[PDB]
Amino acid sequence: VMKXXXXXXXXXXXXXXXXXXXXXXXXXXXXXXXXXXXXXXXXXXX
Amino acid sequence: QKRLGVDLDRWMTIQSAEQPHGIPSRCHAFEKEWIECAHGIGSIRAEKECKIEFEDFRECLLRQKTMKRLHAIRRQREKLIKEGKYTPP
Amino acid sequence: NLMLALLTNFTLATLLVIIAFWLPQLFSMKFFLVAITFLLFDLEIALLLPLPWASQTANLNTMLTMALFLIILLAVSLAYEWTQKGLE
Amino acid sequence: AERVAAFLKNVWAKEPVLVASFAIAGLAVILPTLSPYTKYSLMINXXXXXXXXXXXXXXXXXXXXXXXXXXXXXXXXXXX
Amino acid sequence: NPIIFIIILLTIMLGTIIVMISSHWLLVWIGFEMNMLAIIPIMMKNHNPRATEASTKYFLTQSTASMLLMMAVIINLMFSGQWTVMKLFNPMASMLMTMALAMKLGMAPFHFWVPEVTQGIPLSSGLILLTWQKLAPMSVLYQIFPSINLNLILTLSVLSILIGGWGGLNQTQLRKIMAYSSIAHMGWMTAVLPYNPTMTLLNLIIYIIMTSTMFTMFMANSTTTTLSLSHTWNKTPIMTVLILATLLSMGGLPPLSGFMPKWMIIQEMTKNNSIILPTFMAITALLNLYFYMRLTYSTTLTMFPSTNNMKMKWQFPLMKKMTFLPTMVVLSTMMLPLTPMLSV
Amino acid sequence: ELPSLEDLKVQEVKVSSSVLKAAAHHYGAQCDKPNKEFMLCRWEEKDPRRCLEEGKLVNQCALEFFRQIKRHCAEPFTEYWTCIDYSGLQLFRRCRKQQAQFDECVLDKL
Amino acid sequence: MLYIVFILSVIFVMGFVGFSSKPSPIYGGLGLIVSGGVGCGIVLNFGGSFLGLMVFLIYLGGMMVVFGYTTAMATEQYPEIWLSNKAVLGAFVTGLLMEFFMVYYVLKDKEVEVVFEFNGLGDWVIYDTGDSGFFSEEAMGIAALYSYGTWLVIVTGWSLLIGVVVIMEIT
Amino acid sequence: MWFEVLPGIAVMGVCLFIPGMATARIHRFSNGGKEKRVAHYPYQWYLMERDRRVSGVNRSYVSK
Amino acid sequence: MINILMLIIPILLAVAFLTLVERKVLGYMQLRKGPNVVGPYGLLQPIADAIKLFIKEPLRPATSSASMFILAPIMALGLALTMWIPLPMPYPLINMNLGVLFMLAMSSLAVYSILWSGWASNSKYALIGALRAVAQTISYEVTLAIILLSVLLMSGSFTLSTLITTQEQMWLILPAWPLAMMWFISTLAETNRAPFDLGPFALFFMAEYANIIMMNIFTAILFLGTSHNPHMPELYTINFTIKSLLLTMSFLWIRASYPRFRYDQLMHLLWKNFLPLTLALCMWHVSLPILTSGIP
Amino acid sequence: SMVYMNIMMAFTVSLVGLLMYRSHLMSSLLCLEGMMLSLFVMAALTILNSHFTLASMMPIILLVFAACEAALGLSLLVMVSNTYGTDYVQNLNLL
């Protein structure tokens, strides 16, 4: 984001005091092989 | 309730209540605002005083505001194809 | 993977069916009550499922009064069944 | 006896499996209240910590010390 | 049937208690389905082809009603996620809540089962268990009186009196007339719910008592107008006077206490700048009166149903609340007009 | 949102294996105060953004405990560690005999 | 390949296509085996092994088994082929075109719908949870309890007493 | 006699004996320690997650 | 992943070699001799039956109802082989979060195998005869669920790996003494021929004989075990094979010795005789970990 | 958002499947099982994602009352096949 409108600040929440897990749903979009291994507690189970 | 339950307990209905052992709710902190905001009848009939604390609480369960934001990043990441793209990991 | 374990069993089972077929070249309403009793008892067993699973942490004085109570009504249902059940 | 001696030996002769259905299930209800042994099982059940321990900030408080071995808190030592 | 008939009857009484004394959304869900398992054996009773057809038509409409209601419960987890019966918090879940409760009641679009279910009931004891059953969906509607849209409740209340007022004109079956007065009265029930939730509970009190007085006086076996005709001369003439007090009260007549709902439903609505709707209520209510107009002529006139066979032995039915309740059903408009406060 | 800087995370961490840490619960007795300071910080202030300097003291004290085992009684500790990994998921059963060899060496020290 | 839940959810609706269509109760009975068994996997992917296996024990180990009896009691012997049946295939073809045509719009993440909610990515936010707990956790480690919910145990027991008594009075 | 019956048991002492040995001997090839760990509860899975984070990036079970 | 293939092919050989042991043990129980003309001691007959029944033996269709008749062997053979997966043979193939829940469910899903085969034939006499055989399988799964829930309530969770740890010095036969007799009868449920009897014929009972070995190993874990020993997996497996096969002989014993119960009286064994006994024990097994401390 | 676009769609498809008929009354009760199955999955996802722990018992109770209707209504279906030959929607007497 450099040419758009998003500042990438303040976050989605309007409270800006609590701040939950946040990167539970995010956990970096890049490299899908690492994301699939991270969310596989029930699946495979090794 | 049409008939109230006086001198007897059979609730355990609302979220962020008495835990089975000690297990927390996913939106525990947000209802600590919401129940404390709307314990009186002031924002129950009007529902305007606790609008700020409700929008963040609706954001906790659905995550729609983050969903639109992450889609905007992913689309712009796809826009960088055959352009000035870089991947640190 | 669990899907890798499942599919390999089913594909070899269907493979035996291919060998089985391609390779060779040349009323009574009384039995319904059984299915009724079975399905109604399943749910009482389903409610009695978490017994060696929830007793580890929860209070015993509160549980024991309720745990036996489900088995009591599971036998009380059978006590009503004894008075004229059937010839089968 | 009118039915204590009469309607017991008849139950042994005519379907004695029904004797087991009332006696064993009967002992399952009466014995837990009578026995002075149920108190020990409740003690260890509450003592077993599944969740992580929480430290409280003390300002003039008794029966609380450091994490090291000291004469403080509950800490059940029922039969080693 | 011995004790088991009373136990089944007590579980409908207990079933509505779970609906009444509640806070959890799945708790009322159980309360509705506790009734579903318990009405069906009384629906059957006398081993009839009509009873089998009525119960299957009753179940398949009301089982779908509960599953539509459970959808509204699950959307209440999709948004907000609070399991307390107070508000729906959704413009979508409120639609699937009101329409599901309309299925269990005799409201406009889901009314088709009501006359054919009432016909298949073997006895007068089972006929009460539909008028008393309507207390259960009404109790939930009182709890969720806000957050529910006017455009899909008031339209269902207006249409129900229209279809109720034309739905008994081409009918002679005594069960069918009572089934369409049920559809007619439900329009007067839900019309109050936005304009103060009070008086809806009192509208139940008047309706449930007045309907129970009918079937307890129908203990002398009658299924049609022509079968209730042979009652003036062959049977007791004082019984025709007391049914006259219940026939005329069901329609809008001020000397009788069946005008006591039509007193306050119009009064509370006119307070909130709405006049065009209460006009439409009262005019269509005359069509509801018109069924009883032709049904009063079965008792007031001779009508020639003599029959050669004459009864000498006096009739001995149950008649449990057949004496205490019609005295309150005939006159209470002069007795307690302040009862609005006492009930709600 | 404003998160912490890139050079906020403490150096020298996660050098020990998963079961190597689980082998010794003496870490609960010795070096317990800095662990309890971070624990009390978390229940008072739920955010990880404020309680990170206390966590730097946790990572520093953890290395001080393990280096003592690296210097003295390395032989009975590694033998106990090879025993604890050889078993399935029992993690304490079938290793009590080599647990007797442990603690006895450590008894010479404090 | 990358998706886990979304691929199984399509097969879940595909089973229900055979319910909107009426291909005789025998072939419709096969729907509860396909959509039910896959329906376990949708529950199992988010966690909670106990609740996912409840469909295996009751729906697949009782419910449809008893429904297998009534198919033999009434409307039995032979099921008519759905290819020969009129409008049954018409309901089947219109049923799939409400789902398969939609999936093409779900491609490129976001999609327009009748409801306000959008599709999204469904790969990184598919689990929607980080670490949360540790021992006896995952929300359904201690799932069902007789403690606290003592009232719910009684009322379930009442309805199951009703069921045995009532069906005996019907038949 | 039992020179006929027991060979019918001895052949079962091979084929039914295979699944017990095959599941045990396979951990020699999969792991350098003859062990595979099962999660059961999220705590033991996180230990396996950080074991892949330490030293061996691809391998789950590794020393130090 | 070669282990799955090492739990299908040698497993099907154990089903194939079962037909010899069923003919030889029952043979010696009847003073006749087992197979001898075929091989050295008749050991070459299980492969000889496989060539006979599959290759040249055809199928004359009664009706062949399109989807069925070919679908029923998939529910038979497929579900019987999936049961082998969570079994705690030293270290199981992908150990389940809950062991016995997968064990009870796939056995209750195996009821369809005899149900779909009843639909496979057009004749009414076949399906009425089929539903009667379903009625036996459907009823004894209630007792199968109860006895399991009372054995686990003594010690261990639903995990099959914890059932080995509880039997460190003492078997579960002695604390569950009436249940040991009860579980042995309830295992005779999936058309075992000992209590009562009702694609091609060959592969259909290849799943039915597989379920007999399945229950034989399931008895050898829930009631037997002796020890575990993580140091040597060999010492457990040799000891397990003797314990499992001694129970396999006992299923060939009940079939040999005892006649059919009369279908009605077999249904009188349940509800009237078995269910009042098992529920009273279920009541008793609730109180035991509360009376004396023992809730693992 | 992602999964809820299919399981809600499966509910609406089954909602059509109930009220649409081709004379078979067995198929309607079969769809009532599917309706409860679709309600089971939709409830499971809402409770499992947002870690409630207490509400996990509720779909188990819902599963019990799913089978309560889909047996007692199924018993009435048998009574239709006792009075009449074969179960059909067209075969009725009520007016």
From Swiss-Prot, chain C:
Listed transmembrane segments: 2-22, 31-51, 60-80
Reaction catalysis annotation: a ubiquinone + NADH + 5 H(+)(in) = a ubiquinol + NAD(+) + 4 H(+)(out)
Compartment annotation: Mitochondrion inner membrane
Keyword Secreted found: no
Gene Ontology CC: one annotated term: mitochondrial inner membrane
Membrane topology per record: Multi-pass membrane protein
GO MF, one annotated term: NADH dehydrogenase (ubiquinone) activity
Protein keywords: Electron transport, Formylation, Membrane, Mitochondrion, Mitochondrion inner membrane, NAD, Respiratory chain, Translocase, Transmembrane, Transmembrane helix, Transport, Ubiquinone
Record-linked Gene3D superfamilies: NADH:ubiquinone/plastoquinone oxidoreductase, chain 3
GO process annotations (BP): mitochondrial electron transport, NADH to ubiquinone
Pfam families: Oxidored_q4
EC identifiers of the protein: 7.1.1.2
Record-stated family: Belongs to the complex I subunit 3 family.
Its job: Core subunit of the mitochondrial membrane respiratory chain NADH dehydrogenase (Complex I) which catalyzes electron transfer from NADH through the respiratory chain, using ubiquinone as an electron acceptor. Essential for the catalytic activity of complex I.
Quaternary structure annotation from Swiss-Prot or TrEMBL: Core subunit of respiratory chain NADH dehydrogenase (Complex I) which is composed of 45 different subunits. Interacts with TMEM186. Interacts with TMEM242.
Entry protein name: NADH-ubiquinone oxidoreductase chain 3
Organism, scientific name: Bos taurus (Bovine)
UniProtKB/Swiss-Prot annotation, chain E:
Protein localization: Mitochondrion inner membrane
Membrane topology: Multi-pass membrane protein
A GO MF term: NADH dehydrogenase (ubiquinone) activity
UniProt entry tagged with the keyword NAD: yes
One GO CC term on file: mitochondrial inner membrane
Keyword Transmembrane annotated: yes
Class in the EC hierarchy, top level: translocase
Catalytic function, reaction form: a ubiquinone + NADH + 5 H(+)(in) = a ubiquinol + NAD(+) + 4 H(+)(out)
EC number: 7.1.1.2
GO biological process: mitochondrial electron transport, NADH to ubiquinone; mitochondrial respiratory chain complex I assembly
Keyword terms, alphabetized: Electron transport, Formylation, Membrane, Mitochondrion, Mitochondrion inner membrane, NAD, Respiratory chain, Translocase, Transmembrane, Transmembrane helix, Transport, Ubiquinone
Stored InterPro entries: Complex_I_Subunit_2 (IPR050175), NADH_DH_su2_C (IPR010933), NADH_UbQ_OxRdtase_chain2 (IPR003917), ND/Mrp_TM (IPR001750)
Transmembrane segments: 2-22, 24-44, 66-86, 95-115, 121-141, 144-164, 177-197, 199-219, 238-258, 273-293, 324-344
One Pfam family cited in the UniProt record for this chain: Proton_antipo_M
Superkingdom to which the source organism belongs: Eukaryota
Record-stated family: Belongs to the complex I subunit 2 family.
Function: Core subunit of the mitochondrial membrane respiratory chain NADH dehydrogenase (Complex I) which catalyzes electron transfer from NADH through the respiratory chain, using ubiquinone as an electron acceptor. Essential for the catalytic activity and assembly of complex I.
Quaternary structure and interacting proteins, as annotated: Core subunit of respiratory chain NADH dehydrogenase (Complex I) which is composed of 45 different subunits. Interacts with TMEM242.
Protein name: NADH-ubiquinone oxidoreductase chain 2
Gene responsible for this protein: MT-ND2
Curated annotation (Swiss-Prot), chain G:
Reaction equation(s) it catalyzes: a ubiquinone + NADH + 5 H(+)(in) = a ubiquinol + NAD(+) + 4 H(+)(out)
Assembly mode: Core subunit of respiratory chain NADH dehydrogenase (Complex I) which is composed of 45 different subunits.
CC per GO annotation: mitochondrial inner membrane; mitochondrion; respiratory chain complex I
Broad enzyme group: translocase
Membrane topology according to the record: Multi-pass membrane protein
Protein name, UniProt field: NADH-ubiquinone oxidoreductase chain 6
GO biological process, any: mitochondrial respiratory chain complex I assembly
Keyword Mitochondrion included in the entry's annotation: yes
EC number assigned by the record: 7.1.1.2
Described purpose of this protein according to its UniProt entry: Core subunit of the mitochondrial membrane respiratory chain NADH dehydrogenase (Complex I) which catalyzes electron transfer from NADH through the respiratory chain, using ubiquinone as an electron acceptor. Essential for the catalytic activity and assembly of complex I.
Subcellular location: Mitochondrion inner membrane
Gene Ontology terms for molecular function: NADH dehydrogenase (ubiquinone) activity
Keywords, alphabetical: Electron transport, Membrane, Mitochondrion, Mitochondrion inner membrane, NAD, Respiratory chain, Translocase, Transmembrane, Transmembrane helix, Transport, Ubiquinone
The family this protein is said to belong to: Belongs to the complex I subunit 6 family.
Transmembrane domains' residue ranges: 1-20, 24-44, 46-66, 87-107, 148-168
Pfam family, one: Oxidored_q3
Lineage: Eukaryota, Metazoa, Chordata, Craniata, Vertebrata
Chief subcellular location: mitochondrion
Organism of this sequence: Bos taurus
Swiss-Prot record, chain J:
InterPro entries: NADH_UbQ_OxRdtase_chain4L/K (IPR001133), NUOK/Mnh_C1-like (IPR039428)
Alphabetized UniProt keyword annotations: Electron transport, Formylation, Membrane, Mitochondrion, Mitochondrion inner membrane, NAD, Respiratory chain, Translocase, Transmembrane, Transmembrane helix, Transport, Ubiquinone
Recorded GO CC terms: mitochondrial inner membrane; respiratory chain complex I
Keyword Cell wall biogenesis/degradation in record: no
UniProt-annotated location(s): Mitochondrion inner membrane
TM annotation in the entry: 1-20, 28-48, 60-80
GO biological process assignments: ATP synthesis coupled electron transport
Catalytic activity as recorded in UniProt: a ubiquinone + NADH + 5 H(+)(in) = a ubiquinol + NAD(+) + 4 H(+)(out)
A Pfam family hit: Oxidored_q2
Bilayer topology: Multi-pass membrane protein
GO MF entries: NADH dehydrogenase (ubiquinone) activity
Record EC number: 7.1.1.2
Superkingdom, taxonomy of origin: Eukaryota
Subunit structure as annotated in this protein's UniProt entry: Core subunit of respiratory chain NADH dehydrogenase (Complex I) which is composed of 45 different subunits.
Family recorded in the similarity comment: Belongs to the complex I subunit 4L family.
Function noted in UniProt: Core subunit of the mitochondrial membrane respiratory chain NADH dehydrogenase (Complex I) which catalyzes electron transfer from NADH through the respiratory chain, using ubiquinone as an electron acceptor. Part of the enzyme membrane arm which is embedded in the lipid bilayer and involved in proton translocation.
Protein name: NADH-ubiquinone oxidoreductase chain 4L
Taxonomic path: Eukaryota, Metazoa, Chordata, Craniata, Vertebrata
Gene giving rise to this polypeptide: MT-ND4L
